[PDB]
Design an enzyme around this catalytic site. Structure first.
Site, PDB file in Angstrom:
ATOM      1  N   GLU A 281      49.881  44.179  26.509  1.00  0.00           N
ATOM      2  CA  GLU A 281      48.816  45.032  25.656  1.00  0.00           C
ATOM      3  C   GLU A 281      49.644  46.027  24.905  1.00  0.00           C
ATOM      4  OE1 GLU A 281      45.810  44.694  25.554  1.00  0.00           O
ATOM      5  OE2 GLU A 281      44.719  43.826  27.354  1.00  0.00           O
TER       6      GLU A 281
ATOM      7  N   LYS B  55      34.195  40.898  34.130  1.00  0.00           N
ATOM      8  CA  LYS B  55      35.224  41.616  33.609  1.00  0.00           C
ATOM      9  C   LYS B  55      35.059  41.392  32.088  1.00  0.00           C
ATOM     10  CE  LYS B  55      38.737  43.928  32.831  1.00  0.00           C
ATOM     11  NZ  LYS B  55      38.355  44.169  31.766  1.00  0.00           N
TER      12      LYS B  55
ATOM     13  N   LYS C 251      42.842  40.298  32.824  1.00  0.00           N
ATOM     14  CA  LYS C 251      43.370  41.278  33.856  1.00  0.00           C
ATOM     15  C   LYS C 251      42.794  40.667  35.170  1.00  0.00           C
ATOM     16  CE  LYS C 251      43.567  44.637  30.490  1.00  0.00           C
ATOM     17  NZ  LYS C 251      43.055  45.945  29.490  1.00  0.00           N
TER      18      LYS C 251
ATOM     19  N   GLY D 113      35.880  42.020  27.677  1.00  0.00           N
ATOM     20  CA  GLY D 113      37.071  41.968  26.826  1.00  0.00           C
ATOM     21  C   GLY D 113      36.779  42.291  25.390  1.00  0.00           C
ATOM     22  N   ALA D 114      37.450  43.154  24.906  1.00  0.00           N
ATOM     23  CA  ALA D 114      37.429  43.256  23.505  1.00  0.00           C
ATOM     24  C   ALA D 114      38.712  43.233  22.737  1.00  0.00           C
ATOM     25  CB  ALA D 114      36.676  44.721  23.289  1.00  0.00           C
TER      26      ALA D 114
ATOM     27  N   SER E 183      39.673  48.557  32.751  1.00  0.00           N
ATOM     28  CA  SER E 183      40.318  47.750  31.584  1.00  0.00           C
ATOM     29  C   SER E 183      41.579  48.519  31.175  1.00  0.00           C
ATOM     30  CB  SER E 183      39.193  47.765  30.546  1.00  0.00           C
ATOM     31  OG  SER E 183      39.562  46.191  29.737  1.00  0.00           O
TER      32      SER E 183
ATOM     33  N   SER F  55      41.148  41.603  27.507  1.00  0.00           N
ATOM     34  CA  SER F  55      41.066  42.197  28.600  1.00  0.00           C
ATOM     35  C   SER F  55      40.595  41.334  29.659  1.00  0.00           C
ATOM     36  CB  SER F  55      40.674  43.582  28.589  1.00  0.00           C
ATOM     37  OG  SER F  55      41.493  44.462  27.912  1.00  0.00           O
TER      38      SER F  55
END
Ligand SMILES: *[B]([O])([O])[C]([C]C1=[C]C(C([O])=O)=[C][C]=[C]1)[N]C(=O)[C]([N])C1=[C][C]=[C][C]=[C]1
Length: 263
Positions: free
Chosen positions: A141, A209, A48, A211-212, A105, A45
């Site tokens: 996504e 930002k 983004k 992310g996972a 997210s 993520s």
């Protein structure tokens, strides 16, 4: 700083997985510290931010508007969309979508924003243009989080992401107004609490930002600094660990604490 690297290599041990780390002086753009700076990791993520950079760039060129209202339906919703799932009736403005994608997210918000610019390949084109020939988005996504080992789709390199994020925040790619808008969105990040922010001391500035993704994929990109001003860019990626979310969050937090301690 040598000690931060010690903690990066210790994070690898703890997670049993590769960790990518880089630290850029914001003012000069000079690399302060790195570890696996030129190895590939899934963006997750964190892309983004690049995406909304791409959208703001279009606004700057009068090809899109922040106030434009977009309507979508049930069938557009995917997993993790805590904002876009509330506005099936009223729709959302481009501004609201970029907010949700960055601060929360929101996956659908991201997809919706990908549709406005012509999809993953147009974001990758936008990236090639500004001189990042490494960062690539290939899927939507949530398929982009798959993180299959050695798979180069949807990946970046710490040094590319860091350099690219620096251009977007302090470069000419965006107008002063868009640069500020982007940083404010990252600054209002709501979902990165247990990463860098949990080691961040009162008084410090951070815009980030997170992310996972899958197979232990976890990451964060940040502009941060003391005295309420960002002064460095930090990028941290990891993939391959079987550790729990909490364990992975902690290792990142601890890299953050070491980063701050030896500032
Ligand atoms: B993203 O990482 O592309 C996406 C949404 C998400 C982001 C974050 C963050 O810290 O930015 C945390 C959790 C989820 N990832 C996914 O949609 C992915 N399938 C997922 C979802 C839940 C838990 C792990 C991975």
């Amino acid at each position: 700083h040598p000690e931060t690297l010690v903690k990066v290599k210790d994070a690898e041990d703890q997670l049993g997985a590769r960790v990518g780390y880089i630290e850029l002086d914001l003012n000069s753009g000079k690399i302060l510290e790195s570890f696996r700076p030129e190895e590939r990791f899934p963006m997750m993520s964190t892309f983004k931010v690049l995406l909304c950079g791409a959208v703001l760039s279009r606004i700057d060129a009068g090809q899109e508007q922040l106030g434009r209202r977009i309507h979508y339906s049930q069938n557009d919703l995917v997993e993790y969309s805590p904002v876009t799932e509330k506005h099936l009736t009223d729709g959302m403005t481009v501004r609201e979508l970029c907010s949700a994608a960055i601060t929360m997210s929101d996956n659908t918000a991201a997809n919706l924003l990908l549709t406005t610019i012509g999809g993953p390949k147009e974001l990758t084109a936008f990236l090639h243009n500004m001189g990042d020939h490494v960062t690539r988005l290939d899927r939507w996504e949530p398929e982009l989080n798959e993180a299959i080992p050695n798979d180069e789709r949807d990946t970046t390199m710490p040094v590319a992401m860091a350099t690219t994020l620096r251009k977007l925040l302090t470069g000419e790619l965006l107008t002063l107004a868009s640069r500020q808008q982007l940083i404010d969105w990252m600054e209002a990040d709501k979902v990165a609490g247990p990463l860098l922010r949990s080691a961040l001391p009162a008084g410090w500035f951070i815009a980030d930002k997170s992310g996972a993704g899958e197979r232990g994929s976890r990451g964060i990109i940040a502009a941060l600094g003391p005295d309420g001003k960002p002064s460095r860019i930090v990028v941290i990626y990891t993939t391959g660990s079987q550790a729990t979310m909490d364990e992975r969050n902690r290792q990142i937090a601890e890299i953050g604490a070491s980063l701050i301690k030896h500032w």
